Design a protein around this ligand. Sequence first.
Ligand code: R7S
Ligand code: R7S
Ligand code: R7S
Ligand code: R7S
Lengths: 289, 287, 287, 286
Amino acid sequence: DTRFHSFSFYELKNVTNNFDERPISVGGNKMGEGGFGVVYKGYVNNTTVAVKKLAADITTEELKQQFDQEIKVMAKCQHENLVELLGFSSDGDDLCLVYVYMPNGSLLDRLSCLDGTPPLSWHMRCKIAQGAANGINFLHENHHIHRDIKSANILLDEAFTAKISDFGLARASVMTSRIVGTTAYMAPEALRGEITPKSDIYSFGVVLLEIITGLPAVDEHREPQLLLDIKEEIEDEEKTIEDYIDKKMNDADSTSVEAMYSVASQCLHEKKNKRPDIKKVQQLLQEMT
Amino acid sequence: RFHSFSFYELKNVTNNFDERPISVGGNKMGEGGFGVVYKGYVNNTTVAVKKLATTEELKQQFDQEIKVMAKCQHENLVELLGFSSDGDDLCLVYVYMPNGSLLDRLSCLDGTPPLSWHMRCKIAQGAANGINFLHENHHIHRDIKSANILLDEAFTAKISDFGLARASAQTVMTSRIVGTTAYMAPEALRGEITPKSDIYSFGVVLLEIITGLPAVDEHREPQLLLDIKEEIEDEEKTIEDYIDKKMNDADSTSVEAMYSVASQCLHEKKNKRPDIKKVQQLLQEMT
Amino acid sequence: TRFHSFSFYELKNVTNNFDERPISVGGNKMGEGGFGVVYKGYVNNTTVAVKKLATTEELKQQFDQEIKVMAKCQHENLVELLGFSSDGDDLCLVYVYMPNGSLLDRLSCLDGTPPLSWHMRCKIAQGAANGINFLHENHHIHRDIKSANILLDEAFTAKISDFGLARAAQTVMTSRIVGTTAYMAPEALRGEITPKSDIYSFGVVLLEIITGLPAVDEHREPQLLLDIKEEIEDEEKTIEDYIDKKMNDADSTSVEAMYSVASQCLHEKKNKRPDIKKVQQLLQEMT
Amino acid sequence: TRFHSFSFYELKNVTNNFDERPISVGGNKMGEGGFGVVYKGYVNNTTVAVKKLAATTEELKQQFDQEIKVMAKCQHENLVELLGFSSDGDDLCLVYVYMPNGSLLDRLSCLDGTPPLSWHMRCKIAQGAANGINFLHENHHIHRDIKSANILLDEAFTAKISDFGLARASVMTSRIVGTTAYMAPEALRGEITPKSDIYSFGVVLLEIITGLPAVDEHREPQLLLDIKEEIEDEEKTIEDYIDKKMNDADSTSVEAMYSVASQCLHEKKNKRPDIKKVQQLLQEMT
Ligand SMILES: CC(C)(O)[C@H](F)CNC(=O)c1cnc(Nc2ccc3ncsc3c2)cc1NC1CC1
Ligand SMILES: CC(C)(O)[C@H](F)CNC(=O)c1cnc(Nc2ccc3ncsc3c2)cc1NC1CC1
Ligand SMILES: CC(C)(O)[C@H](F)CNC(=O)c1cnc(Nc2ccc3ncsc3c2)cc1NC1CC1
Ligand SMILES: CC(C)(O)[C@H](F)CNC(=O)c1cnc(Nc2ccc3ncsc3c2)cc1NC1CC1
């Protein structure tokens, strides 16, 4: 149970060029953002870092609870397929969290080639899935449910080692009055209010589909708007997985693409008890390669 | 002017026209409605063989491609090396373009890295100079689109496909309406033939370059890239909202100067459109 | 007697009959020393490391010493013994599989692993220090501290390994001199047995961590990493000139605080060296 | 070909007044040679590399004019691109596109903690560097400074030949130039020939195979060229020198690459293969 560096908000304002909203590509500090905050590049003592400045559709005590949950899970869980918390800032109404800098950002941005990054090869997306399943396994082994498994939450280091991130919504492995997560990846029972490690498997199934097709889980200007719909089109023989494979690759083979699609379709069983456990998903991805 | 090849030579150099994609291990590199392009090797030289597939209409396009290629030679126009006319198998042999088409490079087909804003400007400028030479030599392309803008070893834009080219320099009509709907000018869709229609098709190409989106996508809202121009005109969206996210060097000043050229080109009214010398001047002023 | 008793034929099955091919080449061999070869194995869903040991009564004494020390000492920075196999002349030891192998191989990026960062190196060093402390607190002298013997788990937690040479601490002598020359204290090369020698070997490990260079390299000038300490002491070089270039997060303040600990550990005169609790305090003050 | 004419005061702004701190720390310095220091910069939203030339003054001016003249003629995907330059006063600057993966030298050594290149990537890099040198020899130019530090790598690890200040139109010289560790025997005594470039590329193939730089002061032997002699005299094999920092290397294509390198490193300049033959062999290897 690790202790983290306690930073003062002014130090984090200095290291992030006063939280420059300009993108890092242009010359600024902003690298990404979610509903709970904005991620900035920083330099703490020759160490390149990522500072997540938390900001408000949630309450102030709710955002504080997520900040305390992120810190509590980080203290417990340490793995190579889990991102590392370096420190934090809690002075005043400015909650900041400091992480190691991921040279390749998120799987979402790498699948979409954001900022002009080269398209991931099939072989690389295969290792990224294996890493993220090894990560999701350590969490489940240590009795934790992520509650927000998505490609934006899977980060890639210098070697492209998948490190799953965002533990503000994590639960100790029931129902809830505040339904949270990203609709495009959430399990049917999770959309109701159920909390179960089976929902994490479902969200990962949508992630395997994103990896295969290069398409994000939800696209407003796309037909169909949900990547899950494409699974129904394949099941009803209306389309095949070969028709959806990302054209931005040249090393994808049918045998391994259909083995990965098999894992994804098992993960996307609408009935929670029909889905495989994270150890079975991890076994299938290792057997695929 | 061009090497006369026999059909048997091209069947050997293209592995008997292997339909498998070059990425898999075959020869097929691309294809249109008039034929399929195959990779070939003619004595250590990599070449591209287009095997054409009305009968007399396809023969007229083969003769037009050769006739325009003999006349027009420019740095931004692709080079014809030879041809094969023996039998009912029409083949055309061109230099191998190491970077394929602008369409495939904007979509990163086969995993190629995304083009940067800087290269996208060089490509637009080159394609404008290429259209300019054609219009100067009294020719109307009639099929300007990103699939027809090829990229060499240095990413030099080289206009291709002159089977549909016409001799300019007023406005005439036709019974056989040809081209690609997603890029075609309103008057071209009606049957008019004018170099002004080429300017319109190039406006759609500048939009493809800015957004990374193909002119038509069945599974997209809106299905036509032209529709996005209307959304911007009616203040419903901006060009900044459509700029290709797969590039890190694009800036507002040059993206709005390129969008200005595209908006001028995309005039539904042909005589309001700029001439290719004015489009060429504007793209040069942008950089 | 607190570990799982395995039969030699179970371990033959779990290690693909002790496949000598490297794991990178599709086999089971992961590493090896002078006392045996380490193989990857699977005991159900748990990945394990089986060390197949290869004087006969001397090798048996090391097998019994490893098991006896492991039974007594249990710490987070000490590697865990799962089981063993003593049936016949085949002595096997089973441990938890360290996903990141040894500190030696990670500093050299063996098999293409990404270079360790200064932040990871700092935790590794503190962990190795915390591990040695538990051993010295429980009155044990490792006698073989080196980077090959510092293993790294799924989180890069340093786990000290190889206790076959461990002794039950005061200054005694031996007629059988054991250890690795490149790390051994002057008195330990002479036959002395003292926990002060372990501090010296750890000083060489701190130098390996700082520079990325192994303690001895035949094809290097100087062949001994210890020589580099003399060059720094005589102002002929600085520690900044030796810092591993395969890191981007190394800072002078911490690198000189770690070098200070290493310099204190590398005293030729054993009684001038700090105790493991003082080394542990200094590495805990560095960060 | 015309490049953008920058003023020295303009490039000073884009490079944070030529910050000597390394980019890893938070500064602008990315690398440096004997003829100048490379700085990261931003020209609009374009990330650039500004090479500020520094010491022979008329010799340094001749190299600046030679770099620009060759860049004007030669444009290829495996050749680095000149964006602009600054010649006002005694401060010659050259502006290029920013290479996200720096140089082949720094990637083979994992400078700044980059992951080791895999055998598959090392192969594509060798092929790219062969095609780039092929375009140069096709356009009648001799690089005269082929080395891994001068082979740059973009976002996709596309290799690009850089540094054309020493380039010649395809004789002897009174000013002998280049890097000793890669230079052909004839090049060390003034001869100027495109076969010397093939020799320097042979040393580059050896760097790619072993992960070792051509010259290391703190290494035995200090010259990578010596290791070729040890292999020729059966004293060592290429398997004994293959970079341990890769897990995807196989003996068959590693000995095929060593064959190309051994052919390039010939005693007799006329016995070495032409760049089209080297390019053919590197394509047959994969
Ligand atoms: C390719 C490119 C632009 O160089 C690279 F992507 C830049 N690096 C990053 O974008 C990028 C770098 N480091 C990150 N670190 C990090 C680690 C853990 C964590 N947990 C919660 S927030 C968070 C952030 C995230 C990044 N991107 C994420 C999208 C925000
Ligand atoms: C990136 C990659 C795969 O190496 C490269 F893209 C392969 N090259 C090509 O695809 C590709 C290569 N050469 C081409 N040459 C060419 C030149 C003129 C011409 N006029 C009419 S057809 C035609 C074809 C076209 C290519 N692609 C176009 C689709 C046909
Ligand atoms: C990076 C990569 C290839 O995943 C990693 F290197 C694999 N891990 C291992 O090789 C590796 C994995 N587990 C080990 N476990 C272990 C635990 C205790 C112990 N006590 C005496 S021997 C011994 C071995 C050692 C490893 N390597 C050591 C060299 C033998
Ligand atoms: C991996 C890391 C640190 O991100 C990357 F390496 C940073 N980029 C660069 O270092 C780096 C980036 N761009 C470069 N561009 C470039 C292009 C052509 C050219 N012709 C003469 S000098 C010169 C420089 C060189 C770089 N590095 C070379 C050592 C100077």
